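User: Predict the complex.
Assistant: Input components as received:
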Amino acid sequence: TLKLHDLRPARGSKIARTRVGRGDGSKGKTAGRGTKGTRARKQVPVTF
RNA sequence: GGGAUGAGCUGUGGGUAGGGGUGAAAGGCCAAUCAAACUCCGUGAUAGCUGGUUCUCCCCGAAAUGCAUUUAGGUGCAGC
Ligand SMILES: [Mg+2]
Ligand SMILES: [Mg+2]
Ligand SMILES: [Mg+2]
Ligand SMILES: [Mg+2]
Ligand SMILES: [Mg+2]
Ligand SMILES: [Mg+2]
Ligand SMILES: [Mg+2]
Ligand SMILES: [Mg+2]
Ligand SMILES: [Mg+2]
Ligand SMILES: [Mg+2]
Ligand SMILES: [Mg+2]
Ligand SMILES: [Mg+2]
Ligand SMILES: [Mg+2]
Ligand SMILES: [Mg+2]
Ligand SMILES: [Mg+2]
Ligand SMILES: [Mg+2]
């Protein structure tokens, strides 16, 4: 019989979350921003 | 070293409060703080600025140019 320990999601459905800013083997110190300007600490509006 | 019977010094009690007081006037002083005191709240103010951002390996891999800009250490779009 199928039990609660025989259930598993479809392959490709659940993928892993990207945890940013956790060392140099992943997205490192600046977490993908890189800059020193506006884009390093804030959002730029779309209308601007 | 100056004044040391005077526009003197001092004690006790009181009054004036923050764009307000008080000033023989230095922006002085208002509790070791003053070109607008302190405390709590709005509040986790905002900062094109400086700093910080934490385990791993595999594959690829730039740019520092153009144009516009209250723009020139910022950003949009193109290029990569
Ligand atoms: Mg979630
Ligand atoms: Mg580091
Ligand atoms: Mg940095
Ligand atoms: Mg940038
Ligand atoms: Mg003498
Ligand atoms: Mg004497
Ligand atoms: Mg004398
Ligand atoms: Mg005043
Ligand atoms: Mg003066
Ligand atoms: Mg004082
Ligand atoms: Mg003011
Ligand atoms: Mg508010
Ligand atoms: Mg801030
Ligand atoms: Mg290579
Ligand atoms: Mg520039
Ligand atoms: Mg761009």
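Chain A is about 0% helix and 0% strand.
Let me know if you want any component modeled separately.
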